[PDB]
Amino acid sequence: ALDINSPEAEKNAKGARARITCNAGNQVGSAVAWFNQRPGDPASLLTYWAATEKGVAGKQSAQGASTKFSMSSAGPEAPSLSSYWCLLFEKGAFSFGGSKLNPREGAGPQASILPPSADLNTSGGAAVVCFLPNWYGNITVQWKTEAPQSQANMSWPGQAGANAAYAMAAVLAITKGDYGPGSFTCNASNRGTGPFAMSLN
Amino acid sequence: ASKLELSGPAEPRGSKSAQITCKAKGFPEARFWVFWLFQRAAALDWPAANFSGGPVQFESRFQGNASLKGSQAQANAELNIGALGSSTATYRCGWKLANGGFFPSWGGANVNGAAGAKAPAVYPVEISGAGTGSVTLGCLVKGYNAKPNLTWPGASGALTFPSELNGALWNLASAVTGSGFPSATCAVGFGAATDVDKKVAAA
Amino acid sequence: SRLSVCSKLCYAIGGAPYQITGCAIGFFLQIYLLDVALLDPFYASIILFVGRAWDAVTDPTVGFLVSRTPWTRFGRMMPWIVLSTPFAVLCYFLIWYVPSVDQGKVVWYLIFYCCFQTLQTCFHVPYSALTMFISTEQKERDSATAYRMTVEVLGTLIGTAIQGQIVGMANAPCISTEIDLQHVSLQDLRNAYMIASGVICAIYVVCAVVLFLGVKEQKDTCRVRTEPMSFFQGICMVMGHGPYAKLVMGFLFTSLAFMLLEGNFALFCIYNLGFRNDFQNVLLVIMLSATLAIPFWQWFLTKFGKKTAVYIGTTSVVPFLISVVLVPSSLAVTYIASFAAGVSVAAAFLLPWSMLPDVVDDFKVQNPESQGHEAIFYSFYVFFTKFASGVSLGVSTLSLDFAGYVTRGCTQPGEVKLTLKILVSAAPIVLIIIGLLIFISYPINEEKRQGNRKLLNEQR
Numbered sequence A: 001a002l003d004i005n006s007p008e009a010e011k012n013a014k015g016a017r018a019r020i021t022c023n024a025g026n027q028v029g030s031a032v033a034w035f036n037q038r039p040g041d042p043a044s045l046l047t048y049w050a051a052t053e054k055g056v057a058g059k060q061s062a063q064g065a066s067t068k069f070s071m072s073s074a075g076p077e078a079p080s081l082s083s084y085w086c087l088l089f090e091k092g093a094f095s096f097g098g099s100k101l102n103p104r105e106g107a108g109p110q111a112s113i114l115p116p117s118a119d120l121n122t123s124g125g126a127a128v129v130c131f132l133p134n135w136y137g138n139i140t141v142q143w144k145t146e147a148p149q150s151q152a153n154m155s156w157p158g159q160a161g162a163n164a165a166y167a168m169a170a171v172l173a174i175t176k177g178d179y180g181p182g183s184f185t186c187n188a189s190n191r192g193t194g195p196f197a198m199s200l201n
Numbered sequence B: 001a002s003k004l005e006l007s008g009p010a011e012p013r014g015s016k017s018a019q020i021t022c023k024a025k026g027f028p029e030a031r032f033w034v035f036w037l038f039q040r041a042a043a044l045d046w047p048a049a050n051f052s053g054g055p056v057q058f059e060s061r062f063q064g065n066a067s068l069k070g071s072q073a074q075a076n077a078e079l080n081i082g083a084l085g086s087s088t089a090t091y092r093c094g095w096k097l098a099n100g101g102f103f104p105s106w107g108g109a110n111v112n113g114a115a116g117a118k119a120p121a122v123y124p125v126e127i128s129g130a131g132t133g134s135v136t137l138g139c140l141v142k143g144y145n146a147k148p149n150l151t152w153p154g155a156s157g158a159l160t161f162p163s164e165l166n167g168a169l170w171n172l173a174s175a176v177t178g179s180g181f182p183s184a185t186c187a188v189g190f191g192a193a194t195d196v197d198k199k200v201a202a203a
Numbered sequence C: 001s002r003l004s005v006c007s008k009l010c011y012a013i014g015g016a017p018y019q020i021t022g023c024a025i026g027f028f029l030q031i032y033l034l035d036v037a038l039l040d041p042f043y044a045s046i047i048l049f050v051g052r053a054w055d056a057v058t059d060p061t062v063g064f065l066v067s068r069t070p071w072t073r074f075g076r077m078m079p080w081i082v083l084s085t086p087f088a089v090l091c092y093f094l095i096w097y098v099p100s101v102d103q104g105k106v107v108w109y110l111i112f113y114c115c116f117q118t119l120q121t122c123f124h125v126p127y128s129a130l131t132m133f134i135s136t137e138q139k140e141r142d143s144a145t146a147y148r149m150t151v152e153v154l155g156t157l158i159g160t161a162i163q164g165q166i167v168g169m170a171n172a173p174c175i176s177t178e179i180d181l182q183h184v185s186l187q188d189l190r191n192a193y194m195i196a197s198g199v200i201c202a203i204y205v206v207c208a209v210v211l212f213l214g215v216k217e218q219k220d221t222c223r224v225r226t227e228p229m230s231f232f233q234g235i236c237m238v239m240g241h242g243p244y245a246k247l248v249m250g251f252l253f254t255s256l257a258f259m260l261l262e263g264n265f266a267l268f269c270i271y272n273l274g275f276r277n278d279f280q281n282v283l284l285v286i287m288l289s290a291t292l293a294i295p296f297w298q299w300f301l302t303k304f305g306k307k308t309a310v311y312i313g314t315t316s317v318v319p320f321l322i323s324v325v326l327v328p329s330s331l332a333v334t335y336i337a338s339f340a341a342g343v344s345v346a347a348a349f350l351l352p353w354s355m356l357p358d359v360v361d362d363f364k365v366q367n368p369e370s371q372g373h374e375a376i377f378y379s380f381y382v383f384f385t386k387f388a389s390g391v392s393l394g395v396s397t398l399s400l401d402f403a404g405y406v407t408r409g410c411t412q413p414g415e416v417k418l419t420l421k422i423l424v425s426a427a428p429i430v431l432i433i434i435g436l437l438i439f440i441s442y443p444i445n446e447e448k449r450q451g452n453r454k455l456l457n458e459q460r
Ligand SMILES: CCCCCCCCCCCCO[C@@H]1O[C@H](CO)[C@@H](O[C@H]2O[C@H](CO)[C@@H](O)[C@H](O)[C@H]2O)[C@H](O)[C@H]1O
Pocket: A055, A056, A057, C046, C050, C103, C104, C106, C107
């Protein structure tokens, strides 16, 4: 099969222009389709034969001769911040790449650590929850129970409609028997400086 | 118009079999290849395609795992899936233009190949004895096997994080940035007859 | 006052661009739209049907406008040719140009195909009427017409050679699809087409230049000249004649069968005979065969009469049209059937024109009054052949779309191969059978009665 490669899984753009690039593992002869998928909805055909729209808003244009294709959004709006896919229809086994847009903002992370509740402690469990509700970019969370831990489960939302900032929840599940290692700290490493360490004892 | 209506969500168990239907409208189904697609965590794959009046062509990965058929008497195309365990994804049934190979019409149906069906447990995670301006309260939901809905009484500052699998059950958290703290409660709504609402106390 | 041989040569050469462009378009436009321009076969049938229909509709209107054209300082026909060629070559080049348009390639091809048809009608119809003005002697007119016919045949061969041998060996990769499951670029192919267009455009301009230099006007115009007024009445009178109507219908159906093979034989060669490379040679072979088969049938026209000639010439392709869709025809058998079809195509164009003068004599004997005895017949035949060949090519491409034709696509599905086999071996055979049956009801019976009509021509 022919490998279709969209390099940037995430692109930032607010109201000016987006140029999503699709790279094909083989010369596909200008045969690349483009799909627009909002979350929870099926992919919608935008541009076939790498230049031709299908009942689509005029802002979506495309370009590309062979092995290098682009889709341009010259007027990107709130609906245009969706997940964009490129497909080959040159070879028998059809292939897709995957890419997404998001708006631009500033920065600034926030962190808060929460110990397990008494109810959870009663029923043989202890979950320490670290919340990182508002920040821009990508972030890493480290757990120190006086030593690094690698049993934490992490989850990230999409982008807030108003705040235009991401969040993160890190849950450390420990049994009651193993709940005596000292003090628990959650450390955050965003595009800032220094570890945002919040701790409980 | 050409529209493809699929079955609802399916919940097989481990190594069962799931049959996914795709009713077709607006076009002669016998004239077009109806395709199938496999989207697990935002990465579109291509199981196979079926020409409703003849051949079926599979991907080399899904040889023997997928089994496509078309009940051309009706306007129905089916995908039967064999052994399971990591096939939890969203399955589409596109159809290709009769000249190009691209997909104009699409569907969308989600499979969930897990085991168990339990009631969620609510834990009111709270502050650790600190406060400055606005404070972050929380609510932990642990141990359920469906799609829940966490809410707060008329306060819109909440962030409900996507649920994650830990073993065979789902876990979720909710965080609220409340300035004043007279009284705050976390109310969860679960499909399997669970509507527990727990308040968040201090310390 | 006698025309020089050089002047007749220039007049004949001026009639080559129409044949070259028409042959290139008729032989390669369907595959250019489907496989090179990457158009939906629904959208590439509208273009063909509308293009042809707008050629058929614009030849009589342009004829009327030429009939009302006043005498200038360069002529009654030279202004049309000189003012039409620079735009005709532009529109012809832009037919074979694939634009960078997000939506509406079909509108581009419609507009420029129709504009080229209009601006080449404004070149050919004045050119076709120029034979009545180049000389006043009928012998000189016939000599110039013979030169024009020979150069038309050689131009139909040369245009096939030029378009074929420039859009070939630059083949693009094939777009394999579901059926196929279990370096030259596409831009290298499109440019080839443009190059071919450029070459043809050059020839166009060059021939037009020759047509301006070697041909005079001599505006005596045979003193008082009749003007077409009773067009409908004359058409009705011509249709009322038995042999005339029979000849029109038979020639029309035979030329429809062979204009249903002009367009759908590149696709049949590429996607049924596995000749994605050599299809531009096979066509040339056919055309080359035609160039060497016009004399032969002429000898037949004297050897065994005309009735058996027209009986066997139209049906000389039937066994081979049956054989191409049944026998595998790996390499050589296709060339043999190509030679057979190039004999038959020459027969099915030479023989009806040989039949024509007997019908003209019979009409003159029946109707002494002469009101477009040949001009109205030729205009009727040309209009109906263009219109119905456009309808046939549009229905062919629409049936290919309904069969699931894959753009480019290496192997086509079974339904498209079946439609191609029908479009080459069922519809042409039915049309040829209908034309032959119409030719059966031929009361003239050639020299059985036509010579007697010649005696009437001696009497009157
Ligand atoms: C005998 C005369 C022959 C005429 C042949 C005409 C066939 C070609 C007509 C144009 C092609 C029509 O095909 C279809 O029509 C509609 C309506 O215009 C157009 O689609 C439309 O959708 C968008 C929706 O945002 C509109 O903003 C826009 O006006 C137009 O592009 C496209 O053009 C094409 O999707």
